[PDB]
Symmetry: C3
Subunit: 607 residues, 3 copies
């Protein structure tokens, strides 16, 4: 009669474990260990980049503006028939004697042009010396001086003098620049000077390049300049270089090549650069700038660079400087500065430090820092993102490896310990612990130290009926603790006798009995729900919902890291920068060289 109302469940006939099949629990696994901690060397670091700025220096030009006009007069009007313009060099001798000495220039110009020695007379008059005045003030320009402010033109009546010669002697202070390898240079005027800024006579200067004839170049020793405005002469003297070109004479103070140019530029000072050896490479990290560089395990000889004699000295100045402001107390140096070549073409100067705390290895370390110890130009990349990605990935990589490492270690330690809990629980309830461990409904029992298991058998719910009395009629005072049941293995078969174990297990022997008692209330797992009993008499049925639920579970909500799309982004596009410069040479040239195609006629022949 009484069948389960919660049809939606399963019953299991669990054979007495014959003893034929025996299993053992797996015993505590070897658990991993926290990885060996990587050692970091503390240090001061200076990072260098390829130098891309020109060598820059001061020069002074000496030339005269020569103009020869050809004039012609009509009735109440005059026209230029021509205007000759040229630039002429001031001779060495006039620069020293006249100008530098007295601040004066000759009113005539005499130089070589088109293979001729030529002479021009201001106003076509007799030669004098003229005083030099500042050029009219102009915004953002270096200093200039000139003698003449007007262009001389012949008057209408001078019928034997239809040409008019002007001379304006000009001195200018100009910036000069020279690209590596400093074989020639330019002035601020746009004029190329095809001689090394480092060319000269003394100390292997005569090595450097010159495209000129020897007499175009003078090197004046013990030279004292004389400001042309203050009229004051310098306190110390220089080695004054002068080169006369066809259009100007240019002076400059001679200084040595190697102490003046360097192929590398200091880019970053880093207080704490962390050095950690691994992978056959060193790695250098700076959290200050969030950058990580990677060099070979061997030092890079500073002697291997061309014109790299700013590096050695640039490193130390800043280091000593930093070490003072940060380490002189808590720390000391270790060994003499080292140099390594990072990918990206960076050059790192590194000063190993040491806290007095670990002073015990001073003697130890002082050796190691000398094992990596020991011509070309280094191309540095424009983008540092790689070393910054490297830094970021690394920092994030190590962190999760560590905390997930630690997690994993605990998990194992926790499996090992809970076994002990299962070892006691097996004995209390072998069928359930077996069923769960083994991973299928089984019947089990201890055979000493191992467990026997037999595989259960399913029975339906329409194939399962319940008896409404747990009271043993013949033996009053004695009662079934749980309920009795009848069932059929298949939907239509002999109905069997047994009692309801836990978890809908159908137990064959009705052998589980207690001494009866009063108040008897019970709830017995029955199908998808519970069956209820008062005083060993079947009362009614229920569903799990009909009972409040509490949990034996510890909570944990993990959510995944969302997908994210990184779109291209640039502060200024390649064209914005192409459009930032005021004048564009290509554009101007193109336009200019359209003048005659646009406005005139380049093909027609008249005659």
């Amino acid at each position: 009669d009484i069948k389960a109302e919660n049809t939606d469940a399963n019953f299991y006939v669990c054979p007495p474990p014959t003893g034929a099949t025996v299993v053992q629990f797996e015993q505590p696994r070897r658990c991993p260990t926290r990885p060996e901690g990587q050692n970091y060397t503390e240090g001061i670091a200076v990072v260098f980049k390829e130098n891309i700025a020109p060598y820059k220096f001061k020069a002074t030009m000496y030339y005269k503006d020569v103009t020869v006009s050809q004039v012609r007069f009509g009735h109440r009007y005059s026209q230029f028939m021509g205007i000759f313009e040229d630039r002429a060099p001031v001779p060495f001798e006039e620069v020293i004697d006249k100008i530098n000495a007295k601040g004066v220039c000759r009113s005539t110009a005499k130089y070589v042009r088109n293979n001729l020695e030529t002479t021009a007379f201001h106003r076509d008059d007799h030669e004098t010396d003229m005083e030099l005045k500042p050029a009219n003030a102009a915004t953002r320009t270096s200093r200039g001086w000139h003698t003449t402010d007007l262009k001389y033109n012949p008057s209408r009546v001078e019928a034997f003098h239809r040409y008019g010669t002007t001379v304006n002697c000009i001195v200018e202070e100009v910036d000069a620049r020279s690209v590596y390898p400093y074989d020639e240079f330019v002035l601020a005027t746009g004029d190329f000077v095809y001689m090394s800024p480092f060319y000269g006579y003394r100390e292997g200067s005569h090595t450097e390049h010159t495209s000129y004839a020897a007499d175009r170049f003078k090197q004046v020793d013990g030279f004292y300049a004389r400001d042309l405005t203050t009229k004051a002469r310098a306190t110390a003297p220089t080695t004054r270089n002068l080169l006369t070109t066809p259009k100007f004479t240019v002076a400059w103070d001679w200084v040595p090549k190697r102490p003046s140019v360097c192929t590398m530029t200091k880019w970053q000072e880093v207080d704490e650069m962390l050095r950690s050896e691994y992978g056959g490479s060193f790695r250098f990290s700076s959290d200050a700038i969030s950058t990580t560089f990677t060099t070979n395990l061997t030092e890079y000889p500073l002697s291997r660079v061309d014109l790299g004699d700013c590096i050695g000295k640039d490193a130390r100045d800043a280091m000593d400087r930093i070490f003072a402001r940060r380490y002189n107390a808590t720390h000391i140096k270790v060994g003499q500065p080292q140099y390594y070549l990072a990918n990206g073409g960076f050059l790192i100067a590194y000063q190993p430090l040491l806290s007095n705390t670990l002073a015990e290895l001073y003697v130890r370390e002082h050796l190691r820092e000398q094992s990596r110890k020991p011509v070309e130009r280094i191309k540095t990349t424009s983008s540092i993102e790689f070393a910054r990605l490297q830094f970021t990935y690394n920092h994030i990589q190590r962190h999760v490896n560590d905390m997930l490492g630690r997690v994993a270690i605990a998990w194992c330690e926790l499996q090992n310990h809970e076994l002990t809990l299962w070892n006691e629980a097996r004995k209390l309830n072998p069928n359930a612990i077996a069923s769960v461990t083994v991973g299928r409904r089984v019947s089990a029992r201890m055979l000493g130290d191992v467990m026997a298991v037999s595989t259960c058998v399913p029975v339906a719910a329409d194939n399962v009926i319940v008896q409404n009395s747990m009271r043993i009629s013949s033996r009053p005072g004695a009662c079934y603790s749980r309920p009795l049941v009848s069932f059929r293995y298949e939907d239509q078969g002999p109905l069997v006798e047994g009692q309801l174990g836990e978890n809908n297990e159908l137990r064959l022997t009705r052998d589980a009995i207690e001494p009866c008692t009063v108040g008897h209330r019970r709830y017995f797992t029955f199908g998808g729900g519970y069956v209820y009993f008062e005083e060993y008499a079947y009362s009614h049925q229920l569903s799990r919902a009909d009972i409040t639920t509490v949990s034996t579970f510890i909570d944990l909500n993990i959510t995944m890291l969302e997908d994210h799309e990184f779109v291209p982004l640039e502060v200024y596009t390649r064209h914005e920068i192409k459009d930032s410069g005021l004048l564009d040479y290509t554009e101007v040239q193109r336009r200019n060289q359209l003048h005659d195609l646009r406005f005139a006629d380049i093909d027609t022949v008249i005659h």
Copy 2:
């Protein structure tokens, strides 16, 4: 006789816990809490960058091409002895009266050159006015017009006229550009005009810079232009500026400085910029562009910028625009736009939003958004990678901190709860729970609420023999549940009597007995394996391998994040860009100024 076959194990004699040493389990620890959730302000944002484009405007040049040729004739041939070329300005008056009015130019040119007032006659003939025609079509150029298409040269017979003057009046529409601070400017021709585009007479224009004499500049009020092709005059008038230079007269419509130039440029519009205050700085995040900026907690006054009056207005236009298309319904604004200065030199306009949902704080928030509330130019960096690294690290940082936080919280909660399981397991098996907790083989027993522990003693395996009967001969019906054993503490010593506890513990008192029974099968942990018994009679030995193994362990395979190396990578190297421009000025100059060293002789004097 019977010694263990699995020699590879250890036995422990466990003293009865004297009671001398008592321990307690540690009780539930205080478990951490999920960090206080950081609040995000929703907003619309506009980000600005340093402006690096020139101020660009339209101008018109007026000048005439003047050519004076000098010719000479041989028998059946003629040669140029010279060609004078010059550019002359069109006077103010001719520009207005002749050109703008009628589209005509005078055929003569009269201007000042080299301190002379000079006059040129097309064909050296009498003055007329000539019509202006478009310049011959050219690809990609602005508009031009000219009067003359041929160069006038004197014919062979004209023996009293060996010079030939040409005049070609030219008007061009050209682009003009001016860099900050807009004190001078350039034309598309390459010509510098050394006067502010904003120079003029009205409203403090006369403030701006001019390098010219006053009469070179005219400001024509109520000016109506007349297209020189359509012949149509403009519908409205302008304030027309004209400056006569020595080589051309240049006009342009006068417009005010402050409403025409801005030192900042809008770069990004962001619908949702998230504002979260922390660390004494704000942070602004955009997932749309994956960028995170960092500003001080105080607003940056828009009045603090020079010529920054595009910013205020540029912000609002887009915002109102965005707020409409996205927030007018679900949201409202909060307070008046604010401005902050990010590192990298970015300027963020931010419009705080609010969902009608949280409208309850409208009154609250409306105050907070006014606490940070209130000359120089801002340099913006070219690289945004920092703010994008920042964004990425932050998003990844917060996520693991959170899920590992949650993990940690559960772990603790799980240790606290399982204790309760150990508290029941201690009572069932004190030696084992003690041994594991304590972390060494001990003997234990409850002394009420605390546990007593004594440290066990090791015994070898050759020092351990087993008895092959668990049947008590004298007391049939009574039997040992486990096996009896004999052993010696040291390899050669008095053989002791006791029985085999669990886990190879050697128990001294042979006191563990049961009522005998039938079918008796048992397996007892013996050395590295098990000892087997049927009916209280020793049968044989086994190894763990000889028994199938199931596991009481939950699985978890963590693998570490692999090491990864980020190599330098650039879309175009610094040289590729240096090689992208069609013409290179430095290169051309260098080459050109080699012409005479290469092809001619600059030193030889003839005479």
Copy 3:
């Protein structure tokens, strides 16, 4: 009398669970599954970028330097009154007949200038042919040749010859460059040639642009050049282009447009580019370069590009090359190369591979790789950081999602399994398991398969006294196992009788008794500590500290990922690059065009 010394605790009177309230444990939850594993296609890849380099080619210029000087002599001096300089084209005919054939030039120059046909005579003497010599050696320049090295000037006595004409015929080998769309081009001299490099007569060359008159251009078929130094003529012939401009004639070998220019440039070869379809886009990853690109699911037709016929062929050459060196053995290709357009404007050529191992799908896959299968110019971004961020985030994203996924899965599996432990522990100690699960001090007991719970009641410590005898006087031989106690529910109330359960639970019925015994030592949780008993006689009190503590906890120390700030960092700032070029055009122009404002007088009129 005896009250607890550790006042700092709580006692609970736990009502016998009336049975009124029943709960059930929650049963095993459904646990999540490891996400479906994403499939990666192995491949070879070639990535292309917008081409930004000019089309570069070789040309040869032919022109003559013509100089006409005007001289004048004073007593012991001479002055240049003028110097006419011009460049004249070499006619087509002289280039072929004289130069190319014999390495000679005519000593006269005849070309059109200013609408006149003009003729110049070296030394004003009769015409000859002159031999061509190399230009004087110059560092880093292409080849040149000239006929004349001196400038001819008339001597002092030649009173009927005051002008002096020089001619220097010049040939140069120059680089020429042309920007897209290759309509005009430039020479190394700075000269614009306003004709397509691809202009010509044959095969639709006459399509291309020319700004010149037809007779300025010749196309010489079957042309054999003759080195002007080695005097050796080429082994094969070319289609020689010649264009005469007003200032020079320029030759070059004609080659077809489409096979000579390409709008795209190969940037990267990638051995393993991993292709994984998701989100309606493909993704392409390279660990070699740590870059991830994102394209639409459909192929991008190579026929869609303008002048993109370098791409098809450039792809295969490298691929076949790579496939050989890496895949020909372990792998094979799959389908014909495909092309996709990534964001950032990158173009990826991809060759799908396949290990012989999975050869079983060769037939399957061979179809799929053909489903995405099929004019403008592509702008590529300068910054690749996005695709590298993308790559890094993705790799880090997937990893934590995976290991935290796996973690979560275990956690659940572990909650499910431990329930079974709680199911056995409930029966051993219902009050404690109830109290913990339920989450408040309760009293509990099994009612079959569910648990009854009643909520306990707090009692103070001053409200709790202890009896110093556990020995039952009237029933010697029988003794309380734990202690007896008296207490009051409120500070001043009837003192109640009961005994001390565990965990400071006050049990009402003094029903827990044992048979007395000897040695009796006990410790009973009492307040914040323990109460101690020897032989059922109260001895003294203690604190937890007074007892050593061991732990039932597995350890786990998680630390959070630190906050990190990424500061802007650039290898070279925008100005450093602006300052890297030797000569600056804008600067030079500005300065130059200050010459007269600085040094002369542009306003004063004399007469």
